[PDB]
Amino acid sequence: NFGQVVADVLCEFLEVAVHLILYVREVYPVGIFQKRKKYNVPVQMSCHPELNQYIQDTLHCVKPLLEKNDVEKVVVVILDKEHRPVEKFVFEITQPPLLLSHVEQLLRAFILKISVCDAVLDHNPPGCTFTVLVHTREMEKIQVIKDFPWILADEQDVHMHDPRLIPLKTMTSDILKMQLYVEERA
Amino acid sequence: KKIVIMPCKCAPSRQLVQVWLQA
């Protein structure tokens, strides 16, 4: 009935979210970001071509997992210079089966919470990149186009030793239950 | 069986982007 359209909407949201998460957590210098209107609020999006392509490729590979409801979580993992996870924005996604301004509005909520989440988060070390983790089951065809293969996440990235938990937002509609929450280390 | 996966490539480094931003 709906389904494709949910994934479409969801995938685009995650794109916009990942950019904004990189801007507010200062993973790349603020100078690469330009202001864009998105869900009718001010957001920040990278102008750096290769970064933009990295993000697009990641999410275009996630899309088929979303499209047939195989994504348990999409985690933006922030990593320090030594490639150790300092911070994780976990988007945890369910699409239960079963029984449009409302979706925009509930997505806008997550965007807004990200914008101001600097007010509730311990500011990160210098020298940071990120990666994306996707919790799923056992896309091997968009990996092969793209030249953007995926590989099992290392145990150092999945486990965070004794993490602090900072929820930002929850939505619970009929179509979609999503909780966004951060994990920090001590 | 439940699995976590990641992109094999790393995102652009902060340094590489900084240089892009300079030049």
Side-chain angles (χ1 to χ4, degrees), chain A residues 134-153:
Chain A
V134 161
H135 294 255
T136 356
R137 305 266 183 179
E138 303 170 1
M139 56 168 285
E140 306 108 44
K141 69 197 193 282
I142 307 188
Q143 289 191 71
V144 180
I145 301 161
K146 308 282 140 249
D147 216 11
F148 198 79
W150 288 64
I151 236 304
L152 291 182

Side-chain angles (χ1 to χ4, degrees), chain A residues 26-28 32 48 54 131-138 147 149-151 153, chain B residues 1-14 16-18 20-21:
Chain A
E26 294 179 333
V27 190
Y28 294 99
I32 75 168
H48 190 261
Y54 181 88
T131 180
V132 182
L133 272 58
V134 161
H135 294 255
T136 356
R137 305 266 183 179
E138 303 170 1
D147 216 11
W150 288 64
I151 236 304
Chain B
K1 211 131 63 64
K2 285 176 292 188
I3 54 159
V4 192
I5 58 175
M6 63 190 306
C8 192
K9 296 201 227 277
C10 289
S13 73
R14 176 176 248 290
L16 182 48
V17 176
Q18 202 136 252
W20 179 93
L21 189 50

Side-chain angles (χ1 to χ4, degrees), chain A residues 16-79:
Chain A
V16 170
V18 168
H19 284 246
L20 192 68
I21 288 172
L22 297 172
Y23 168 86
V24 304
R25 309 307 296 155
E26 294 179 333
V27 190
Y28 294 99
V30 298
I32 75 168
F33 302 91
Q34 64 171 216
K35 207 295 299 294
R36 257 179 127 288
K37 185 173 262 63
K38 219 71 172 148
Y39 304 102
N40 207 33
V41 316
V43 300
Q44 295 292 320
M45 308 253 286
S46 158
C47 305
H48 190 261
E50 291 100 299
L51 174 56
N52 293 4
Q53 199 65 45
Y54 181 88
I55 292 158
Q56 281 185 54
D57 294 352
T58 304
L59 295 175
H60 282 52
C61 294
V62 172
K63 186 137 176 194
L65 306 184
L66 288 173
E67 277 176 343
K68 63 213 184 211
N69 186 34
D70 297 332
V71 181
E72 188 184 301
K73 299 171 184 159
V74 176
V75 187
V76 174
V77 175
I78 310 283
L79 298 159

